[PDB]
Coordinates of N, CA, C and O in Angstrom, one line a residue:
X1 N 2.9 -7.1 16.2 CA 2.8 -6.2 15.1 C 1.6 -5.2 15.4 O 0.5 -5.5 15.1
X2 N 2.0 -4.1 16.1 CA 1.0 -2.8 16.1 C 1.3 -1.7 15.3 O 2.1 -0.8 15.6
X3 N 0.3 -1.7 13.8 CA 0.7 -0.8 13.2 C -0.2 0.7 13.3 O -1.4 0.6 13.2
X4 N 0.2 1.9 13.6 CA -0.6 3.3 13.8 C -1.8 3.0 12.2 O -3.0 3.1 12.2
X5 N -1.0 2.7 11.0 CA -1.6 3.1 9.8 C -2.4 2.2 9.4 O -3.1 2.5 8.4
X6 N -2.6 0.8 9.9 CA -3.6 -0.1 9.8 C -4.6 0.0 10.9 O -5.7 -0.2 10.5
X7 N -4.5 0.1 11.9 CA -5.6 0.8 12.9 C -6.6 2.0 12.0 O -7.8 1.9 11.7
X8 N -5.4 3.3 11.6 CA -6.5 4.1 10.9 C -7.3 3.3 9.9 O -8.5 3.0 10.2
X9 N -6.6 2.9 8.6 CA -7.3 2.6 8.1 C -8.6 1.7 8.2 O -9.5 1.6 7.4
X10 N -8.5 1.0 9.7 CA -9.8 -0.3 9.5 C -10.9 0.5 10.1 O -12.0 -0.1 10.1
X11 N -10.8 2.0 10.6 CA -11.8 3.1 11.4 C -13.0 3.3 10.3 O -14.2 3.5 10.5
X12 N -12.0 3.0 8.6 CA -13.5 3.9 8.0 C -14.6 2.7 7.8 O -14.7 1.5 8.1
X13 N -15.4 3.4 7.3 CA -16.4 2.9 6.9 C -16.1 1.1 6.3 O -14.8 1.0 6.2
X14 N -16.7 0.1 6.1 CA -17.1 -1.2 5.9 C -16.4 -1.1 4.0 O -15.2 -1.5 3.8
X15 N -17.2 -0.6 3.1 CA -16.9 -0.2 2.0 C -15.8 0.7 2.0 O -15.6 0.7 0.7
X16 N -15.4 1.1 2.2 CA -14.4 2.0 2.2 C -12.9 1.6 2.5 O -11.9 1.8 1.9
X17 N -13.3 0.9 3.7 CA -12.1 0.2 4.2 C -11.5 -0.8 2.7 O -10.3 -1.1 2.4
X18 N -12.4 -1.1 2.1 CA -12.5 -2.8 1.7 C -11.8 -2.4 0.2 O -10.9 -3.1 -0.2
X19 N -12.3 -1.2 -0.8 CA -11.5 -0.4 -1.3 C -9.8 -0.5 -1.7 O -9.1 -1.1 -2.4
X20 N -9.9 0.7 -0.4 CA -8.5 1.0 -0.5 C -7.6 -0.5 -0.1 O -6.6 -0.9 -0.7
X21 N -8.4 -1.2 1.3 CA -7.6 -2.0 1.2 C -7.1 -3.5 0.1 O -6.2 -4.3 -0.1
X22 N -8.1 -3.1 -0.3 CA -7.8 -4.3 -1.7 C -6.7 -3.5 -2.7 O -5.7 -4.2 -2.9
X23 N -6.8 -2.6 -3.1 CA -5.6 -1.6 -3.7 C -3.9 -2.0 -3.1 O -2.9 -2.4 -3.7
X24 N -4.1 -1.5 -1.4 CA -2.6 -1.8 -0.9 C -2.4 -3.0 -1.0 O -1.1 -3.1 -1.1
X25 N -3.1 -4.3 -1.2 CA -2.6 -5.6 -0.6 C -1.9 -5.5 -2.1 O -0.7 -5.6 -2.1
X26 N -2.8 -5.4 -3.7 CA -2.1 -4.8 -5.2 C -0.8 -4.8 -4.8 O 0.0 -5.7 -5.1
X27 N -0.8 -4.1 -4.2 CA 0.5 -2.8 -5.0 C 2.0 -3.8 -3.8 O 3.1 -4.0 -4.2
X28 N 1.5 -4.2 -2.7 CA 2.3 -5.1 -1.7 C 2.9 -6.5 -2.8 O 4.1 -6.8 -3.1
X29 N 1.6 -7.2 -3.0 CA 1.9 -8.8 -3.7 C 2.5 -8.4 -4.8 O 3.4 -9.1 -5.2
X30 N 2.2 -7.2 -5.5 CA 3.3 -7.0 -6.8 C 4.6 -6.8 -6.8 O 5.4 -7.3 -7.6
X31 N 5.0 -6.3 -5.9 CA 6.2 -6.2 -5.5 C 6.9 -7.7 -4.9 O 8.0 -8.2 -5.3
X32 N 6.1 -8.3 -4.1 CA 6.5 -9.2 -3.3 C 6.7 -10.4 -4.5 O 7.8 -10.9 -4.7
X33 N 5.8 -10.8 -5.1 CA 5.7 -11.5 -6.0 C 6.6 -11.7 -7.1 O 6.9 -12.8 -7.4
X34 N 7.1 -10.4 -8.0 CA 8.2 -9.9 -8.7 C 8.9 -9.3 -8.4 O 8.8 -8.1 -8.6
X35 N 9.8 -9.6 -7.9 CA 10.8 -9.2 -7.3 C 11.4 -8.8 -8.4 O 11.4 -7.5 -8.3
X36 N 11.9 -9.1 -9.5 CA 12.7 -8.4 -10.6 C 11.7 -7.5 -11.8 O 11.8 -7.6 -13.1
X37 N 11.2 -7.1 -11.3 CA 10.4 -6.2 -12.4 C 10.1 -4.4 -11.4 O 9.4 -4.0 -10.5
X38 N 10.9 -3.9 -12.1 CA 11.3 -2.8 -11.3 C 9.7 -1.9 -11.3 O 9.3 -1.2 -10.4
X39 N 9.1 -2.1 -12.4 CA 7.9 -0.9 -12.5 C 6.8 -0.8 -11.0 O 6.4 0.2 -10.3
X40 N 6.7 -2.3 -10.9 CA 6.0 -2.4 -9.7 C 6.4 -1.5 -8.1 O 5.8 -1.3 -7.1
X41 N 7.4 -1.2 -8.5 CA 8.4 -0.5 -7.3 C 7.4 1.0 -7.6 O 7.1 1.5 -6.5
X42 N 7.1 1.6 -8.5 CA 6.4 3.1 -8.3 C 5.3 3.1 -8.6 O 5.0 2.7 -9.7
X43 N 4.2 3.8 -7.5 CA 2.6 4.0 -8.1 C 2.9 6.0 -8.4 O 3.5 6.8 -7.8
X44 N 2.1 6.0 -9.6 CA 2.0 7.4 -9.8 C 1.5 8.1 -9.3 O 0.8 7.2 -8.7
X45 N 0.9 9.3 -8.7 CA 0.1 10.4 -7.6 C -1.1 10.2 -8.3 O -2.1 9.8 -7.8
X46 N -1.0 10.5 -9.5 CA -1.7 10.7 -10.4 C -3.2 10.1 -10.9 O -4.4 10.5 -11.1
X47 N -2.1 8.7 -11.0 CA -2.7 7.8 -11.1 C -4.5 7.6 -11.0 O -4.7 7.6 -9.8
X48 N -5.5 7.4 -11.6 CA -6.8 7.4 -11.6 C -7.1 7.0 -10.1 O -7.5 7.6 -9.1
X49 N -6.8 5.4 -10.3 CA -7.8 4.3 -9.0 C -6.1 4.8 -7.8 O -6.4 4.9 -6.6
X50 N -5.1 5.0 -7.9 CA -4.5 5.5 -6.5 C -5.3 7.0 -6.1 O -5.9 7.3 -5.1
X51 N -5.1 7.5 -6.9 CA -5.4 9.1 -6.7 C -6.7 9.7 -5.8 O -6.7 10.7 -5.1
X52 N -8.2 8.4 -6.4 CA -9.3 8.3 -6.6 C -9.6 7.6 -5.2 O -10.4 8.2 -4.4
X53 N -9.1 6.5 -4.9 CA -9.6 5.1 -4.2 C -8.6 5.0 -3.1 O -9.1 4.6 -2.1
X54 N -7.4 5.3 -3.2 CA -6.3 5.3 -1.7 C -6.2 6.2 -1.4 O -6.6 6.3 -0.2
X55 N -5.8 7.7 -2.0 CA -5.2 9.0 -1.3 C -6.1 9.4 -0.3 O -5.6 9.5 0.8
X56 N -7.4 9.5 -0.6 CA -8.0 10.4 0.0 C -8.9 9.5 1.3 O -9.8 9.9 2.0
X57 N -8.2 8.0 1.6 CA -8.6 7.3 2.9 C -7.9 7.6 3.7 O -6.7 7.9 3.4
X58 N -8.7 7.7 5.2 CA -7.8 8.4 6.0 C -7.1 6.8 6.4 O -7.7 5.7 6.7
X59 N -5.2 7.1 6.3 CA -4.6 5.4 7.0 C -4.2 5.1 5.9 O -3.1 4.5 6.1
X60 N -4.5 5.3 4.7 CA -4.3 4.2 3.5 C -2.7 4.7 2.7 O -2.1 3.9 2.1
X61 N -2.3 6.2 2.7 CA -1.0 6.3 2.3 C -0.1 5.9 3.2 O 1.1 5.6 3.0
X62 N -0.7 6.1 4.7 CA 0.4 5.9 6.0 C 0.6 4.3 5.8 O 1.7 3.9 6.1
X63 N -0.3 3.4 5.5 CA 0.0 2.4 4.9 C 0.9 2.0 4.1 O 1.6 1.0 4.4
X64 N 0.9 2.7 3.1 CA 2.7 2.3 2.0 C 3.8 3.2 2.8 O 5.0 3.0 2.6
X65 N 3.3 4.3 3.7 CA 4.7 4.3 4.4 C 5.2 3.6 4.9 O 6.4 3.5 4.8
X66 N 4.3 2.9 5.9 CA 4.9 2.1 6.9 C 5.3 0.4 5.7 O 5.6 -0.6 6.3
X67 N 5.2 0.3 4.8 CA 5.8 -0.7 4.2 C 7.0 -0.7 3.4 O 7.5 -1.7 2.8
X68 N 7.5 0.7 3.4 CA 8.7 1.6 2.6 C 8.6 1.9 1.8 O 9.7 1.9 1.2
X69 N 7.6 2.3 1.1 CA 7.7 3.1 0.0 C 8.0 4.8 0.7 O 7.9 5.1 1.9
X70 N 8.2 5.5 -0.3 CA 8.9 7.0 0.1 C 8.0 7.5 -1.1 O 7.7 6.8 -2.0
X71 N 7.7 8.8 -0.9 CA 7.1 9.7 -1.6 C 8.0 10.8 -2.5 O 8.7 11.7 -1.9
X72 N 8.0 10.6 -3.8 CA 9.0 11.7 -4.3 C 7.9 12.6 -5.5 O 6.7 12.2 -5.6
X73 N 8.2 13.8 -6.3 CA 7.0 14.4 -6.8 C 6.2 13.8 -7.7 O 5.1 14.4 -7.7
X74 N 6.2 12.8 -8.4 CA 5.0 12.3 -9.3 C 4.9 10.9 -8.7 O 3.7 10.6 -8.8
X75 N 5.5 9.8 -8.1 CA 5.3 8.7 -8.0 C 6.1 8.9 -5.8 O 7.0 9.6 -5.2
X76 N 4.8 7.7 -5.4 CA 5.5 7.1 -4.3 C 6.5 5.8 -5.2 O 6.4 5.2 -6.3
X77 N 7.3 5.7 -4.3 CA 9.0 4.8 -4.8 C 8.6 3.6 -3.8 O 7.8 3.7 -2.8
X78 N 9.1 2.8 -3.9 CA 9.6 1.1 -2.8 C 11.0 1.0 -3.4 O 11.3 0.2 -4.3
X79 N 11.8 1.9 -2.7 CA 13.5 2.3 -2.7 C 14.3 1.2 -3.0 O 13.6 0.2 -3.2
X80 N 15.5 1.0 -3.1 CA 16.0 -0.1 -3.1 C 16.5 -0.8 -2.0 O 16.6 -2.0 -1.7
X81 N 16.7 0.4 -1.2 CA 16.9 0.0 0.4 C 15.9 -0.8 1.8 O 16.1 -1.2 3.0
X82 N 14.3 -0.7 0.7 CA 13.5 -0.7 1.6 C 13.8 -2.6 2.4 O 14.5 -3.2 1.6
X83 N 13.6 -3.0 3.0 CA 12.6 -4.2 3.8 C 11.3 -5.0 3.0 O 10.2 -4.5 2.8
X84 N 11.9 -6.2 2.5 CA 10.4 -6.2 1.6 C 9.8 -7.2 3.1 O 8.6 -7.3 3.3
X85 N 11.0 -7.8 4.2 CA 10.1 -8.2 5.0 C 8.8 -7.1 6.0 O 7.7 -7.5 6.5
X86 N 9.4 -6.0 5.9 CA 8.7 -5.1 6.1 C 7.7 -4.5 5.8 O 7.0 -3.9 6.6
X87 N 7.6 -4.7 4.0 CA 6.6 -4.7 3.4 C 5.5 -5.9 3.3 O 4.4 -5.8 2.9
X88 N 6.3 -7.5 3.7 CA 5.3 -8.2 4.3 C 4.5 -8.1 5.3 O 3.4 -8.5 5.3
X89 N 4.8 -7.6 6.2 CA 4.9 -7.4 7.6 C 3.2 -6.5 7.4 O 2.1 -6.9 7.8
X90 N 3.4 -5.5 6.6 CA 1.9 -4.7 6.7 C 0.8 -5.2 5.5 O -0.4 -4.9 5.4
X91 N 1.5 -5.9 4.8 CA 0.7 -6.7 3.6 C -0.6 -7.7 4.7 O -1.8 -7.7 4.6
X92 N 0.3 -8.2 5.7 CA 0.0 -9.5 6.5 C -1.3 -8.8 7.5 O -2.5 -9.3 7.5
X93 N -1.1 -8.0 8.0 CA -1.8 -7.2 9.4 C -3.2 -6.6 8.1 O -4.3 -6.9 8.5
X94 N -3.1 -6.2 7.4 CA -3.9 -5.7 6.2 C -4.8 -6.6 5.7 O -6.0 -6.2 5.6
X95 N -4.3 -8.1 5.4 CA -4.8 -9.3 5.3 C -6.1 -9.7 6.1 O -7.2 -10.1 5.8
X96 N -5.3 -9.5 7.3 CA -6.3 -9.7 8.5 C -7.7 -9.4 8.8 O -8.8 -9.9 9.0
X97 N -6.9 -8.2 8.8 CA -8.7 -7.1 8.6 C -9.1 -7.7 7.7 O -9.6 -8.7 8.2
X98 N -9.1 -7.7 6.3 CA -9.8 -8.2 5.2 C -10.4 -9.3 5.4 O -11.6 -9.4 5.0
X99 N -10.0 -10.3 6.0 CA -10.1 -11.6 6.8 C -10.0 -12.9 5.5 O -10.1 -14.1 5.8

């Protein structure tokens, strides 16, 4: 598992890193976890702590890409088509770093 978007993200800063990555692992186990609760499937753009605390790390949206969410105009989506092994897959490598 070599991900381009977990590399970026472990570049920033100690605090920074630790941030956003506590955010993605969120937004991963919620889905993983509940599988039948659809809400979990969209973060808003908007949103305060995504908007605030993920968007603007460099790595950290290329992160929910590479776990399948898709970006549409007010919310990123986790489609119905996505891989949730997929989305374990960068949950796990994200884990890591975190240690």
């Amino acid at each position: 598992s070599a991900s381009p978007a977990v590399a970026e993200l472990c570049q920033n800063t100690p605090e920074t890193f630790l941030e956003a990555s506590k955010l993605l692992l969120t937004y991963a186990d919620n889905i993983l976890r509940n599988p039948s609760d659809e809400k979990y499937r969209s973060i808003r753009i908007g949103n305060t702590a995504f908007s605030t605390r993920l968007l603007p790390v460099r790595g950290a949206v290329e992160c929910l890409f590479e776990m399948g969410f898709e970006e549409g105009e007010t919310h990123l989506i986790f489609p119905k088509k996505a891989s949730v092994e997929q989305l374990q897959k960068i949950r796990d490598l994200i884990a890591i770093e975190r240690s």
